[PDB]
Amino acid sequence: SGFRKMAFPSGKVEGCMVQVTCGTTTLNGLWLDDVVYCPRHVICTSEDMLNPNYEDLLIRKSNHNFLVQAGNVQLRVIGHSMQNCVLKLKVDTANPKTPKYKFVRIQPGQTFSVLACYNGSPSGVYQCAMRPNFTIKGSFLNGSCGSVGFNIDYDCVSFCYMHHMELPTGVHAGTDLEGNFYGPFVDRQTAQAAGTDTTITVNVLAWLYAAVINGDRWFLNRFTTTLNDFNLVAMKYNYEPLTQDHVDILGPLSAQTGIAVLDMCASLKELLQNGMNGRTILGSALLEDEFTPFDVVRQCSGVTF
Amino acid sequence: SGFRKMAFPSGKVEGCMVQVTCGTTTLNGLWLDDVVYCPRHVICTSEDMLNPNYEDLLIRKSNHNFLVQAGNVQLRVIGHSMQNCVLKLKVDTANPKTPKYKFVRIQPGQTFSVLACYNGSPSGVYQCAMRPNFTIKGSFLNGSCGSVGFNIDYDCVSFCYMHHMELPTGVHAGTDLEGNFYGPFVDRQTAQAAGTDTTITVNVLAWLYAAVINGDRWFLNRFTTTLNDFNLVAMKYNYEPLTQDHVDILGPLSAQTGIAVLDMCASLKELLQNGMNGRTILGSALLEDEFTPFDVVRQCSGVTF
Numbered sequence: 001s002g003f004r005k006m007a008f009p010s011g012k013v014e015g016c017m018v019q020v021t022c023g024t025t026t027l028n029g030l031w032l033d034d035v036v037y038c039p040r041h042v043i044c045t046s047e048d049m050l051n052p053n054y055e056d057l058l059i060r061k062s063n064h065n066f067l068v069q070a071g072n073v074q075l076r077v078i079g080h081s082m083q084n085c086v087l088k089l090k091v092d093t094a095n096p097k098t099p100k101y102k103f104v105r106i107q108p109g110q111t112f113s114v115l116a117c118y119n120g121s122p123s124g125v126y127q128c129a130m131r132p133n134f135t136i137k138g139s140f141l142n143g144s145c146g147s148v149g150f151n152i153d154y155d156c157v158s159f160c161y162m163h164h165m166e167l168p169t170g171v172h173a174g175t176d177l178e179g180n181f182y183g184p185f186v187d188r189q190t191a192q193a194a195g196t197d198t199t200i201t202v203n204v205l206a207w208l209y210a211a212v213i214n215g216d217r218w219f220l221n222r223f224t225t226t227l228n229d230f231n232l233v234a235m236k237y238n239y240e241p242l243t244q245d246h247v248d249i250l251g252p253l254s255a256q257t258g259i260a261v262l263d264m265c266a267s268l269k270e271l272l273q274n275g276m277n278g279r280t281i282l283g284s285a286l287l288e289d290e291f292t293p294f295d296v297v298r299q300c301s302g303v304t305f
Numbered sequence: 306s307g308f309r310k311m312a313f314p315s316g317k318v319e320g321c322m323v324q325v326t327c328g329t330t331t332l333n334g335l336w337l338d339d340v341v342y343c344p345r346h347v348i349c350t351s352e353d354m355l356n357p358n359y360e361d362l363l364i365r366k367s368n369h370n371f372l373v374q375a376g377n378v379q380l381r382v383i384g385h386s387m388q389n390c391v392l393k394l395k396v397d398t399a400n401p402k403t404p405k406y407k408f409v410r411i412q413p414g415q416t417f418s419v420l421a422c423y424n425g426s427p428s429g430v431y432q433c434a435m436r437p438n439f440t441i442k443g444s445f446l447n448g449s450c451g452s453v454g455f456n457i458d459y460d461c462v463s464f465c466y467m468h469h470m471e472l473p474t475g476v477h478a479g480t481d482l483e484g485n486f487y488g489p490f491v492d493r494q495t496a497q498a499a500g501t502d503t504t505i506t507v508n509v510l511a512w513l514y515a516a517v518i519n520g521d522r523w524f525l526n527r528f529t530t531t532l533n534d535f536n537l538v539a540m541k542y543n544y545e546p547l548t549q550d551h552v553d554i555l556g557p558l559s560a561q562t563g564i565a566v567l568d569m570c571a572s573l574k575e576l577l578q579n580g581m582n583g584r585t586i587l588g589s590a591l592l593e594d595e596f597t598p599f600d601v602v603r604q605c606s607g608v609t610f
């Protein structure tokens with residue numbers, strides 16, 4: 001038993017990380033098959049970043065302006081192109097460690113693992129959620145750009161996130177691997193703000209099922225609620241609305257524990273209106289919303305890859 | 306910026322995990338060079354586990370009673386031996402993925418990454434601390450035994466933990482890679498209890514420095530304290546004593562932030578006596594003690610491997 005914020009094993013991704021240097025700027029790239037993906041702002045100076053014209057900047061660059069280094073090996077760039085906010089550098093050697101992979105755009109609330117890298121080398125791995133305001137609360141320092149987020153499905157790596165910037169609040173923004181930002185953000189150093197973040201209600205309920213599975217039951221109550229009445233309370237505490245689709249996705253956890261989804265909603269309702277009274281749930285004094293229903297099933301049934 | 310519970314990249318360890326089957330019992334082994342390490346209770350039946358005589362049980366086993374499977378490859382066992390609570394199976398093939406490694410016994414308070422595995426395959430990776438009562442609060446299901454804990458130092462994997470059992474409280478116990486349990490526990494299914502757990506004071510202070518580095522400063526106060534006076538308060542809240550060695554280890558964080566260690570102790574003192582008043586520190590309503598001082602420096606300076 002036990003319940004931890006668990007990341008995916010990172011070896012399949014570690015074997016894809018490289019270092020991309022253009023001019024004096026160095027960040028990470030993702031080497032799949034014969035293409036290296038990296039944030040396009042690698043082609044900027046420290047001065048360009050206020051409002052760069054990336055089209056113009058890339059036109060002035062030749063293949064040999066991009067230094068791509070896999071470990072100590074030197075990769076030869078034989079082509080370069082821009083797709084939205086990411087650079088695609090064609091190299092002369094396919095990565096022999098290329099896993100089976102897919103590029104996917106995740107939805108707010110879904111979780112993934114981040115392999116935080118500097119200079120093409122891994123620093124650490126951690127799990128996090130795409131917030132409802134399309135930011136993530138990561139741990140990223142200068143040079144971490146080009147670090148990727150991912151999920152694993154049996155043997156297939158689903159890449160969903162490439163890191164590009166930090167907004168003043170310590171919050172992090174990036175793109176999918178097709179180069180489109182999550183949220184309204186742009187890769188230039190002009191003033192930008194994330195907008196209203198809310199709590200991922202379906203994930204909190206998932207985590208309450210996780211607590212029951214692991215023996216924390218004090219919050220189960222005799223009350224029940226309707227879906228609309230629950231959302232009346234949720235909205236007041238800046239929780240995302242719970243939809244019928246969310247109810248369906250919580251179905252299997254409800255079946256495993258024998259606690260109807262609306263009965264668990266009624267328990268959450270009381271927690272929101274009364275607090276925890278200095279009690280804890282899975283060691284936490286706050287309601288946790290970075291576990292999806294599938295994250296709970298995976299970890300509590302021991303799914304492997 | 307940002308601060309997350311970060312695990313080490315797990316690829317070097319993933320390449321060492323195998324599946325060991327004896328009779329009907331299957332757990333994980335660690336394949337380094339030409340030796341596979343696994344928990345010795347793999348040689349028990351479901352009935353033996355009450356009070357096995359492992360010496361006797363192993364004597365009745367032949368090399369071919371141990372089925373060792375690396376992926377789909379079948380390893381040949383050519384030798385078997387017992388060191389304390391772990392089995393050492395000699396195989397006919399060195400692991401080609403063997404990293405540079407060391408076996409180390411960590412001390413209470415120190416952190417490591419756990420690569421949770423089933424049937425020799427990774428399920429996930431998470432960071433945790435050796436509690437003062439020599440247990441860990443992990444996430445382990447049946448079949449997870451033989452999963453290992455580890456740290457990385459540049460290129461060297463320091464293996465410190467092999468998982469063996471769960472005590473009734475959902476708490477987890479295991480050995481170092483020489484087979485000796487952390488704590489007073491024994492690998493048989495007789496009644497056992499962990500004993501008094503306490504909060505890892507030096508780690509909480511580390512995490513308060515981490516909060517300052519990341520911009521949370523509301524808890525810094527004008528007060529100061531002596532080391533003995535702080536420990537008078539700490540003991541009352543079941544915090545481990547802070548020693549002069551702990552002060553020295555916090556030195557570099559104190560120098561980076563400009564906050565003397567005893568001034569941070571004074572801030573912790575007020576937090577303990579007054580609570581947080583519904584405030585949070587790095588998103589947490591409770592004081593976090595699973596980060597060592599070096600974990601904070603690593604993550605906040607971007608150390609790589």
Ligand SMILES: *[C@H](O)[C@H](CC(C)C)NC(=O)[C@H](CC(C)C)NC(=O)[C@H](CC(C)C)NC(=O)OCc1ccccc1
Nearest residue numbers: 041049141142143144145164165166187189190191192
């Ligand atoms: C890439 O490694 C690096 C990672 C960060 C964690 C530092 N990203 C950048 O340097 C990035 C490059 C630009 C061209 C996309 N810039 C930022 O992320 C920048 C961070 C600095 C200012 C600390 N943030 C930024 O410009 O945010 C928009 C903004 C600007 C001005 C006022 C408010 C908000």
Ligand SMILES: *[C@H](O)[C@H](CC(C)C)NC(=O)[C@H](CC(C)C)NC(=O)[C@H](CC(C)C)NC(=O)OCc1ccccc1
Nearest residue numbers: 346354446447448449450469470471492494495496497
């Ligand atoms: C190995 O994969 C598995 C992992 C656990 C997470 C289930 N470990 C065991 O099966 C282990 C084998 C014994 C011989 C060391 N047994 C236990 O960990 C056992 C767990 C069961 C009872 C759920 N725990 C145990 O025996 O604890 C001691 C005990 C016994 C009786 C009363 C209180 C405490």
Ligand SMILES: [Cl-]
Nearest residue numbers: 225226227228
């Ligand atoms: Cl309804």
Ligand SMILES: [Cl-]
Nearest residue numbers: 285286590591
């Ligand atoms: Cl908390």
Ligand SMILES: [Cl-]
Nearest residue numbers: 530531532533
């Ligand atoms: Cl003193």
Ligand code: NA
Nearest residue numbers: 226228229232
């Ligand atoms: Na209603």
Ligand code: NA
Nearest residue numbers: 531533534537
């Ligand atoms: Na004193």
